[PDB]
Amino acid sequence: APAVPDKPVEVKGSQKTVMFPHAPHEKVECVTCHHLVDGKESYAKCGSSGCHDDLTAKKGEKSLYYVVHARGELKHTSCLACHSKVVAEKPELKKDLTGCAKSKCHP
Numbered sequence: 688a689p690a691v692p693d694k695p696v697e698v699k700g701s702q703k704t705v706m707f708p709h710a711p712h713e714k715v716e717c718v719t720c721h722h723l724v725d726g727k728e729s730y731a732k733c734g735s736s737g738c739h740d741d742l743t744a745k746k747g748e749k750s751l752y753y754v755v756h757a758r759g760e761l762k763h764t765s766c767l768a769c770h771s772k773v774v775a776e777k778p779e780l781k782k783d784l785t786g787c788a789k790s791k792c793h794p
């Protein structure tokens with residue numbers, strides 16, 4: 688597959704941009720986030736046209752916000768869904784991984 692980015696990359700929303708760092712996720716399988724689409728591999732941007740291209744709505748499969756922040760039952764793992772579990776085991780990282788403000792995602 689392509690080489691994983693070695694510097695934080697930009698995850699553009701409609702107003703905010705959150706930097707995503709691959710290094711701390713080196714042990715997570717690529718497919719967990721870059722999930723298969725139509726049975727095929729894809730490393731395209733999450734908010735690509737035809738993917739999670741609704742950058743303003745809070746819900747719906749097309750909502751980038753939803754695929755990122757939902758803790759609900761999803762077809763794939765969201766950032767918050769996994770972070771909740773990590774935080775359950777490492778409570779000292781609650782603010783860093785799940786905070787809406789002053790977190791590692793939203794400083």
Ligand code: HEC
Nearest residue numbers: 698700701702703705742751752755766784785786787792
């Ligand atoms: C606490 C539970 C949080 C609240 C409430 C919000 N976030 Fe986040 N967030 C993250 C990413 C990767 C993005 C960019 C992609 C996108 O969702 O569009 C954002 C963006 C926002 C936004 C603005 C949405 C927009 O610009 O269209 C809002 C209002 C927002 N977030 C609220 C990632 C993360 C993250 C990293 C794991 C955490 C802990 C949070 N966000 C927490 C919250």
Ligand code: HEC
Nearest residue numbers: 688689690691697698707712715716717720730732733734
């Ligand atoms: C979730 C925790 C992830 C894991 C595990 C991996 N990647 Fe990733 N990657 C993820 C995001 C949120 C982003 C930003 C996409 C965006 O919306 O901008 C990326 C980006 C990439 C890219 C660059 C594509 C691009 O954004 O233009 C590549 C080439 C990439 N990721 C590769 C990759 C590989 C090979 C992985 C496993 C070793 C891998 N990623 C894991 C989220 C996640």
Ligand code: HEC
Nearest residue numbers: 720721724731732733737738739748754761762763764765
């Ligand atoms: C288009 C080629 C896509 C890219 C690139 C990414 N996603 Fe996706 N995602 C896409 C579809 C067609 C679907 C529906 C389910 C399916 O697998 O066919 C999804 C689903 C998700 C989900 C679950 C959403 C739900 O409502 O259950 C999540 C959590 C999700 N996608 C996350 C995600 C992330 C973080 C991506 C970037 C690394 C990403 N997707 C890329 C289509 C596409």
Ligand code: HEC
Nearest residue numbers: 707708711712715719720764765766769770773777791792
């Ligand atoms: C589990 C399968 C994960 C998914 C999906 C996402 N993240 Fe993650 N993240 C995970 C771990 C194991 C860690 C490290 C915790 C530790 O023990 O130290 C992280 C860390 C981050 C961080 C913090 C890095 C730092 O600055 O210290 C960020 C900012 C982060 N993760 C972002 C992020 C985003 C935006 C995701 C969705 C695209 C995402 N993570 C998914 C585990 C998992």
